[PDB]
Amino acid sequence: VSLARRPLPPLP
């Protein structure tokens, strides 16, 4: 997976 397509962090 490229940098753009990594999992997003959870919302805080």
Partner 1 sequence: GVTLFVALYDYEARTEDDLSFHKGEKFQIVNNTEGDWWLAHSLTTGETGYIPSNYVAPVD
Output the smallest distance, CB 10 to partner 1, in A.
Answer: 9
Restricting to residues 1-12, which ones interact with partner 1 according to CB under 8 A? 2-9, 11-12
Q: How many CA atoms lie within 13 A of 12 on its CB side?
A: 0
Output the smallest distance, CB 2 to partner 1, in A.
Answer: 7
Chain breaks after residues in the chain, where C lies over 2.5 Å from next N: none
Q: How far apart are CA 1 and CA 10, in angstroms?
A: 18
Using CB under 8 A as the binding criterion, the count of chain residues that bind partner 1 stands at 10
Residues forming contacts to partner 1 in the complex (CB under 8 A) are 2-9, 11-12
